[PDB]
Amino acid sequence: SGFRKMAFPSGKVEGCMVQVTCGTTTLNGLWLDDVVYCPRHVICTSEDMLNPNYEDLLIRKSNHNFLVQAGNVQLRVIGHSMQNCVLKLKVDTANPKTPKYKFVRIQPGQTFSVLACYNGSPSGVYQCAMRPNFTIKGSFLNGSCGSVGFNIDYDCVSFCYMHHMELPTGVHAGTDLEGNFYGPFVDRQTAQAAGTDTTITVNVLAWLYAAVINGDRWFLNRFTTTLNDFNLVAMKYNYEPLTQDHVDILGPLSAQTGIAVLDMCASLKELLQNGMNGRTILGSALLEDEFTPFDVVRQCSGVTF
Amino acid sequence: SGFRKMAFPSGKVEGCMVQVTCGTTTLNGLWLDDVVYCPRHVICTSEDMLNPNYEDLLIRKSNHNFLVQAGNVQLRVIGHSMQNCVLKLKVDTANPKTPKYKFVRIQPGQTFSVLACYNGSPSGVYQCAMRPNFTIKGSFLNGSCGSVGFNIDYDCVSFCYMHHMELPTGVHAGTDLEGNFYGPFVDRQTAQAAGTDTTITVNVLAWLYAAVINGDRWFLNRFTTTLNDFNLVAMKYNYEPLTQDHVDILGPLSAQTGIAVLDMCASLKELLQNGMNGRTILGSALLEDEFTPFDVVRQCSGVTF
Numbered sequence: 147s148g149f150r151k152m153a154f155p156s157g158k159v160e161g162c163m164v165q166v167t168c169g170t171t172t173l174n175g176l177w178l179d180d181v182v183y184c185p186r187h188v189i190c191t192s193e194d195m196l197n198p199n200y201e202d203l204l205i206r207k208s209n210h211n212f213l214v215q216a217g218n219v220q221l222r223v224i225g226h227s228m229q230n231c232v233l234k235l236k237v238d239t240a241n242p243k244t245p246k247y248k249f250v251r252i253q254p255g256q257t258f259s260v261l262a263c264y265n266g267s268p269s270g271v272y273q274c275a276m277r278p279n280f281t282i283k284g285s286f287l288n289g290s291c292g293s294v295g296f297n298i299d300y301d302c303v304s305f306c307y308m309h310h311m312e313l314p315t316g317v318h319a320g321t322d323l324e325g326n327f328y329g330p331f332v333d334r335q336t337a338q339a340a341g342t343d344t345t346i347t348v349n350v351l352a353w354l355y356a357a358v359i360n361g362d363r364w365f366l367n368r369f370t371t372t373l374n375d376f377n378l379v380a381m382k383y384n385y386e387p388l389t390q391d392h393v394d395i396l397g398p399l400s401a402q403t404g405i406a407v408l409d410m411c412a413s414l415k416e417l418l419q420n421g422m423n424g425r426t427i428l429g430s431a432l433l434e435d436e437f438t439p440f441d442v443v444r445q446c447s448g449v450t451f
Numbered sequence: 452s453g454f455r456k457m458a459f460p461s462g463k464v465e466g467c468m469v470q471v472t473c474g475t476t477t478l479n480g481l482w483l484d485d486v487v488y489c490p491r492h493v494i495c496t497s498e499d500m501l502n503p504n505y506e507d508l509l510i511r512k513s514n515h516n517f518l519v520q521a522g523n524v525q526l527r528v529i530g531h532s533m534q535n536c537v538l539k540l541k542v543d544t545a546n547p548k549t550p551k552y553k554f555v556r557i558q559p560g561q562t563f564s565v566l567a568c569y570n571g572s573p574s575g576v577y578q579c580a581m582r583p584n585f586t587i588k589g590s591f592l593n594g595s596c597g598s599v600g601f602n603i604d605y606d607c608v609s610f611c612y613m614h615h616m617e618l619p620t621g622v623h624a625g626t627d628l629e630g631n632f633y634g635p636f637v638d639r640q641t642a643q644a645a646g647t648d649t650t651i652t653v654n655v656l657a658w659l660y661a662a663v664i665n666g667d668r669w670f671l672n673r674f675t676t677t678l679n680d681f682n683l684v685a686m687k688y689n690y691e692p693l694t695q696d697h698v699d700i701l702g703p704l705s706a707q708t709g710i711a712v713l714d715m716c717a718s719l720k721e722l723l724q725n726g727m728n729g730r731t732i733l734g735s736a737l738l739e740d741e742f743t744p745f746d747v748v749r750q751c752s753g754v755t756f
């Protein structure tokens with residue numbers, strides 16, 4: 147029993163965190179094999195960050211301009227290149243702690259673990275989701291840039307996020323490990339705002355199924371709904387549209403609990419129109435949307451890494 | 452900006468998790484130096500569990516009765532002893548991944564990270580607090596026994612909890628790393644129940660101070676309160692009594708925000724009276740009590756918004 151927001155064990159990722167310094171800027175880097183990946187804005191001064199021509203800033207730099215530190219050992223940069231918004235620093239030594247890895251681009255609604263670092267030192271780990279507006283409601287301070295998001299499959303670490311900036315509403319923006327941003331954001335000190343957010347419907351439903359598994363059935367009713375009728379109600383409460391793919395994905399949870407997906411949708415329809423009425427689901431007074439159907443199944447089965 | 456429930460990086464602990472088998476029972480063990488620590492109920496059957504004589508069960512065991520597995524390597528047990536509710540198995544190999552560590556006993560309200568394991572394999576990490584009733588609202592399944600709670604402060608891993616059992620209300624009970632239980636519990640399958648739980652007042656206050664640091668003041672009022680008058684109201688809402696020690700501990704947060712502890716106590720008195728009225732504090736519709744005053748200073752910035 148018990149349902150907590152759970153992150154993946156961060157050990158495989160901790161052994162990859164290095165500190166990258168270019169002039170006055172200091173942020174985090176991911177050391178995989180003989181390459182260190184970090185945000186390209188490390189070459190930017192507070193003057194440059196306004197309208198930076200990154201190719202022009204990088205062409206002036208030499209390898210010795212980049213100081214890379216792994217624990218207490220200094221790494222020797224022997225080459226540098228740029229891929230989108232990420233800077234790739236070819237180092238002299240291959241990381242002996244390099245795990246089995248992949249660079250994957252995650253979709254909105256999909257969750258991941260974040261290893262928050264400052265000066266190449268992991269300070270904390272937390273789980274979070276890629277919002278439909280492409281921001282992440284993370285927990286970062288100055289120096290957190292270059293912190294990474296990841297998932298674990300078996301022994302394979304799937305890198306999906308690198309931190310770049312904080313938006314004026316306190317939410318966060320970053321890129322996949324190939325330097326391509328998530329969302330309509332650019333790596334510049336300019337006026338940027340997150341788009342209006344929506345609730346991840348398939349994740350709320352999965353979290354309602356998780357509550358049924360933990361013996362919370364007060365919200366269940368005798369009613370069902372059509373997929374079209376549920377989406378008309380959901381669109382009115384700023385919920386993401388539920389697709390047939392979402393219904394199919396909730397199949398195993400529906401089979402395990404005995405509550406059809408459209409039956410569980412009629413319970414969510416009632417929670418949206420009437421509220422909780424002083425009640426909680428899994429100790430929460432709000433409908434939680436940062437647990438995917440796979441996260442629920444993994445936490446209610448005991449999958450190890 | 453941003454305030455998340457954050458666990459410590461689990462890497463230093465992952466390198467200590469081993470699988471311990473005695474007959475038919477299989478649970479987790481903590482391998483530090485040449486000793487593996489695990490719940491003593493690994494020598495028990497489900498028949499023994501009602502009224503087990505552990506000294507009588509252990510005297511009938513030899514070293515080769517205990518199978519210890521570290522990854523894919525088998526460890527050779529060369530000695531065994533019992534310290535309270537923990538079984539200490541002396542092994543032939545010292546753990547090369549042994550971090551700097553300490554065994555610390557915590558008090559209710561103290562938080563810690565849990566590395567949930569099954570068959571000596573870490574499956575997840577989550578943050579949680581020692582409840583005033585000495586239970587932990589964890590997330591554990593069968594086989595999780597021997598999973599550990601810890602805090603990594605600076606370069607030292609402070610082991611504070613080892614998982615032993617789940618109570619009928621779904622909450623969890625365990626011991627410190629010296630085998631002494633937290634609470635009035637025994638490692639017996641007997642009719643035992645958790646005492647009535649209470650809210651950790653000093654932690655809720657710290658979390659209100661964290662919200663003020665992140666630029667939220669909607670809950671503050673022009674009132675102050677005496678310590679006794681606040682406790683009379685707090686007891687009525689099942690909140691732990693706030694002591695002078697608690698007030699002193701909130702000193703740095705009170706100094707940083709400019710809101711005296713008894714002024715923040717008056718805001719809490721009003722919050723319990725009025726509820727939130729559709730509003731949230733740090734993205735929560737409930738008053739959070741699993742962040743200590745120390746956690747808030749560690750996670751939040753030194754400059755208030």
Ligand SMILES: CNC(=O)C1(N2C[C@@H](C(=O)Nc3cncc4ccccc34)c3cc(Cl)ccc3C2=O)CC1
Nearest residue numbers: 187286287288290291310311312332333334335452
């Ligand atoms: C809110 N930050 C700022 O005002 C500043 N900023 C710095 C940086 C950025 O956002 N860093 C952060 C990232 N995560 C959490 C932060 C918390 C607190 C301060 C900074 C944080 C950044 C990067 C890029 Cl690609 C584009 C623009 C900026 C940028 O504007 C400082 C000027």
Ligand SMILES: CNC(=O)C1(N2C[C@@H](C(=O)Nc3cncc4ccccc34)c3cc(Cl)ccc3C2=O)CC1
Nearest residue numbers: 147492591592593595596615616617618638639640
């Ligand atoms: C909930 N408990 C049980 O179903 C049973 N049980 C077994 C065991 C125990 O609690 N194991 C678990 C530990 N953490 C999470 C569990 C979740 C689900 C099942 C088991 C779990 C145990 C150990 C000790 Cl020292 C004292 C009592 C028990 C005990 O009562 C089987 C009866």
Ligand SMILES: [Cl-]
Nearest residue numbers: 556557558561
């Ligand atoms: Cl303590």
